[PDB]
Amino acid sequence: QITFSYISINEGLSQSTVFSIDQDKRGNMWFATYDGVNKYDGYAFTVYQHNEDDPNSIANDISRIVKTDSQGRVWIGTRDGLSRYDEEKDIFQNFFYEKNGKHLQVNGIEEISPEQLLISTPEGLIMFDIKESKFIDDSFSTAMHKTIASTLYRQGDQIYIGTSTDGLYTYSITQKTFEKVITKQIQAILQQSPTRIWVATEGAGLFLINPKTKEIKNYLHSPSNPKSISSNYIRSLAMDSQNRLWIGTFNDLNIYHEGTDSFASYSSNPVENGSLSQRSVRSIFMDSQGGMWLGTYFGGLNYYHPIRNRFKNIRNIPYKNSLSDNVVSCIVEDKDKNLWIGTNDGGLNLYNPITQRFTSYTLQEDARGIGSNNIKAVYVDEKKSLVYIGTHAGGLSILHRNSGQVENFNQRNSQLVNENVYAILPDGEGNLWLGTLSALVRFNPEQRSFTTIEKEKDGTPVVSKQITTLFRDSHKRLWIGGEEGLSVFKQEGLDIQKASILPVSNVTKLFTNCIYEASNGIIWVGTREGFYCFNEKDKQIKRYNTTNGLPNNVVYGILEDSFGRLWLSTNRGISCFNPETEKFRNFTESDGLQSNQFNTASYCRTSVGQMYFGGINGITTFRPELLLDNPYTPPVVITKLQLFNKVVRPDDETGILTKNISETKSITLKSWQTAFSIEFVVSNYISGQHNTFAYKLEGYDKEWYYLTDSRTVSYSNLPQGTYQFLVKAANSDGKWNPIPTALEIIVLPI
Template identity: 30%
Template sequence: MLVALLLSLPSWAQREIRLQQFSIENGLSQNTINTIYQDSRGYMWFGTQNGLNKFDGRNFTVYKNTSGDTTSLSNNDVYAIFEDHEKQLWIGTRSGLSRYNRSRNTFSNYDYPEGRVYAMRPVWCIAPADDDHLWIGASGGLFKFDKGLRKFEHFKINDSIQNANSAKAICRDRAGVLWIGTQIGELMQFNPNTHQFSKVHFPQEGTVNYAIASIVEDSEGMIWIGRDDGSIYRYDITTRSFKEYTFLKKKYPIRTMIEDKEGNLWVGTDKGGAFLLDPNSGRVSSLGQRKENETDVVLSLFNDAKGDMWLGTYHGGVYLFDKMDTTFQQYAPQDKQENASQSNSVLSIFQDDESLWLGSDGGGLLQRRNGTVKRFLQNTTANSIAGNTILCLEAGFDSELYIGTYADGMSVLDRRTGKFKTYNQRNGLSDNSVWVIYNDVDHVWIGTNKGGVNVLDKRTGKIVHFTNVMQDERTISSNTIRAIFKDSRGKFWIGTVSGLNVFNETDSTFTAYYYRDSSNTISNNNVLCIFEDMKKNLWFGTHGGGVNRYDARSNTFTSFQEKDGLAGNIVYAMLEDAQGNLWMSTNKGLSRFDVVNQVFKNFDTRSGLSSAQFNIGAAFKGKEGQMFFGNINGVTSFFPHHIRQNAFIPPVVISDFKLFNKPVLLGDDSPLQETIDVAKEVTLEHSQSVFSLHFAALNFSHADKNSYAYMLEGFDQDWIAAGNNTTATYTNLDPGEYVFKVRGSNNDNVWNEQATTLKVIVKPPLWKTWWARTLFVLMVAAGLYMAYRFKINAIKKQQELLTLLVDQRTAEIEEKNKLILETEKRNAQLVHQKLNDELATKSKELTNYTLLIVQKNKLLDELKKKLKDVVRNPGSSNLRDFRNLVQMINYNFSPEKEWKEFNANFNRIHKGFTDTLKEKFPELTSNDLRLCALYRIDIPTKDIAEAMGISQTSVKMARYRLRKKLNLSPEEDIHDFLKRC
């Protein structure tokens, strides 16, 4: 149980419990939290002195009263929140009762209209009555609210004393009886059937009663009452007897109480913080250290669906307590730093049967035993530790403790006598900076910072040095040693800053392993730690290359780094738990490595660590399996089997919808007709081309570690792994129907595989609708028909003109023939012959035009027939016919074809105008030549634009470019110039 866990903290551990805080800096509207509630969808709600807050783990949505807006919250001071069986959320405020309309994101407000004395203001608490009613505890007494009729029924507790009617606390027990605590300290029972109050008397009730702040029914049916004097009573309904708990009496006033899922009673107090009471054993524990104006006044408590506890404070915001965060315990060697050379950094750790030994950075050696601390410091006496910065600790086989210091050599402590013996450069060490010590049967191996490896013979006291010799590959690869280890096969491994070495005992030489650009070599030459697991696998932690596993059979290495899930690529120390998992301290926290499945689980400050930056070699595993890791803020201790995975499967919600990165308001012309977390679909115009969906997995403990995956069905081919990103943005989708899906996990990567979905409909533009396309085809057909009629009329007019011309010429010829019949007979014959030839040519042209018109008339008839079929059957089955129809129109009524006929006729009339212009100005394009022809015959700009299928502005631009190509001065008129050509 949680109380037992808190009470069982080791004596050396600090009692501060890590809480996750949310305040105005995170978006909360105000730091005084009057009430807390979690709704059925999984959102957390916080009632403050300045608004109502909805929280999804990342973002707060704030609701406040807006003057003149009757659909806003009735008042910003919120005291109670309750959700009924219909999942309607009810809010008690200083101005009455409000109901939250989830789909419209508005509020409906209700108040009891009668008198000031018995006014329903404020509403202190809300409790269920039945499906159709609510019980309201308010300053004016008890009220029953009919949700269907929207009417109140008032029950006065006391007619003579005004404060006696102020129902500060209400509890409806499992029998349906109401328990009411008043401002003047009276505990009342209310029978909902008879509408009668009866007073319940406390034992040894005096003349002074204290206000009742909280009433709770526990899982066993007991009624708990918390009062303003700090006293807590448990009332047994069966025996009608009280039991009093006095551990807070006359110390801290009670402000709130709640039972958690383990049966513990949580108590929030004024100036005392939060306490936990085990009702069975009566044991009490304080929830960590109180902080003035932060966690010392707890006004509200709530146990969420996961089992975590929320604490609402006065001026401190809201705190989340995850009992999993209590698994890591911390200890700092220095309560106060006496000088700049001291720090809380723990560089080495050792535990024997009686004591925990810690090597500090500047603070000497610490021995913690039976709750007391003894510090060994360097001094001028002969029997003292060599130095105050302790880099390593290693136990001897008897009572010796070997101690390596940063700059003062190695000390050996006899733990029985408390006497020290020191080895340094004066008596055999090659270097006074001792980084690692390994105790063997007859020898002590000492790794130094600059003097290589020193081996101390325990029997003779002599020291042998192994150092690097340039150009001799048989010597150790570097004199800077960081790790020494003897494996189960009897091999000595030495980690240096420049390679990994194996000692060859037969000839006292070394074989070095170096990093090379190969996948089966060690990943980094700077080796910080060496470890052998229970399966005899060797592991090497490096400075920048992660951790390496050595395969003795193939003499190769396999590395695991950040890209594989390791917390950080600098691995300082390793330990193994009873399940065979490796625990590694890194520069970015702790990593637990499942060797079999090759999966990492990482822990950092958000998981309860005091620091994520650990120290080289600072690790120790106790006999009971407790692990210790030294970091820059002290030492972290834990039992691996106490660390549980968060098994809570979080609900996933779509929390916001934005167009062009702006929030979308509800409205008739809006894509949203109801709030996005209620809506099943969203319909967008084709112009609303950029939209974003925001989502949240409602796991609130370390929510920044929640992960997400989403896809837009119909657009995305597969799920998109989004990490902890909570937004998906899409742009320029084709018209159609899509389904947005999102899944989420909690902070321990436990996924909710049931996707939350939203249908997204993108409407096509007007010109892409089937009826618009049909209308377009009809307009094209009508245009072609008009063009056909225009050509027929033109031909008729040309025929009439030619007939008139022939008649006039014939009359002139006849008149001339009469005058000069004799003398001009031959000339007349020649003129007549020429005229007949011209008429034959024109007749041939007219015949050709007539045949062309007849052919196009047939095509138009065919188009009309097919258009009727498309209009009668507009479905997708006629799509091929529609395409064939469009191809036929494009082929037979090509604008390019018409331009060719225009050019041919124009050049015959204007004597090769186009060819002459092209020869003079070769850079002119075909469009330029068409434009010149139209300007020569003085066609208006508007008609030119229609003829060429471009805008009038484009015609003006083309005219400007044409003037430049024709080298015209600003004064020259283009029409006059072209007429001269």
């Protein structure tokens, strides 16, 4: 099971077609597009395009190839010619090879030595001297010089050359020999082992070559066999961290299996979300983290890493057997391990986690009508094979599972006092507690009667208030909560008496959403203004709000995993809370959730251990025990320095930088230079944009300082002296980079 992330125009990409992908010594990703050259550092895009007035820009917007050498230098192949990105000066060095009047296009770049480069043109092959910054055309033999090369690939000593019609050739650097290997055009060359070389071709298919025996094996497409490759037109080959072949074709993605000798086809699917963005793959690259990048012709980019595969989403698909409405309320698991999902505008859904099937119930024009399509509460009478439904603006609905008939109760037909049932819980005696917007109602199922509660077990007037949630603890006590607040009760038969066990606090008068009893006996209550715990042993309440590390105050539901940690649904994502450390691990929509905003009663933990959180745009389901840790902690790269908000450039009038800010070890600031803001980045693609930075200015700052949403640090009016800036990198999972990034700052007298 493999799903992709999407990076396209809306993400900051210049043009959808990604011809070539590479990574530099800094860790930044490089993408060659039909319109521009894109640099991605894990947070922001840096689009490089041609300027007619500025010579420092790239030669042309149409780039076709990108290759990084041994030294870490980035080389681009444009229509106008060759261009190198100078990191030190943050500029482009444009080179042109003019023949017969026009400058020739660069199709492929390959390294011969740290001082030499192999360049392929639509007219032949030429060598570029790096040290002399000039092209040499009188270096190759006549047969080699006029060879039209479509692809270039190096393996240690030998560089393999794929041509348009002449098949395959090889070139030794030491011996300087040009020999054939032995109709169509070659697009990609990749070697698995000294006995296995894979060759991608235009319509000729795939070829496995054993150069030791010179034996060849062809792979073609047949429409009858789905186990074969999808298309004969292939243009990209890559190896993953798990030592597997990745095949990018004109149609779909192919992955070779060693044992079965077959291929797995991964297609562009609009229905099943998470699938490939476009059908035509053109470039595949593995970063240092191991994450696979797929460059398509129209769909932008596709990222995949096993660790980032964390959350699964369940949404409505029109004209398909799927969820009815995206606005999800209560989720209840029965004895059959099925889920009774409630919705706001779609009715009641019955979902089988194995069979993927959905069974809906809606309002009918009079017998299978459920009163209202706005479900809030669900209870399963497993012994009687009945389901009790609580709907907003409808009342109580009783479903007979073995016939499908529905009994409806409201204010006009029955003695029910309120048509808005929000919570259903068994009394233990046989009846049911009904949490409505005005009062609490007891329902006798054997008598079909509604009893409004107005008195305690001593005749203490029960305030007519809003009831949204009901909970029964291990000590068989009833918990009643709503907007008015929380309350605790005992049950002396049918009568209820308030057992005041909570200490006097204004939190008992808070908008109550949910109550959960943890495995350690501690009671946890989630309200609209944070959440808290209740330890009855000593009678204490510890409150937890946003300034404690919580993403949002409005907590809709709490769930406990195998490790004792608590999972919370808010208006701004899901939070993982460890009561011992009192720390938070937060997840947002960008991490893979249905939406940052979640909904009331939309929390469910299965008997197996799976968690289900519903919101406004569907349900997010995951296994907290199965979630993978990110082991990668990349160094911090300082991307930008601004003086008085204006960006400091190398060799600019300020004269602070002559090298790039990334290259700079120390900066000297003159008397008139008082304000500056430093922006930094971390190249973590698994964690993505969820990273913690620790900064400190040695000599000025007393302690370290932490950043979770920001990346820029501003300082002003510093005293004279020599200071040091340090910055550490924590990933999403909380692992640190021990050795920080250091840039010295020298403040001159005033």
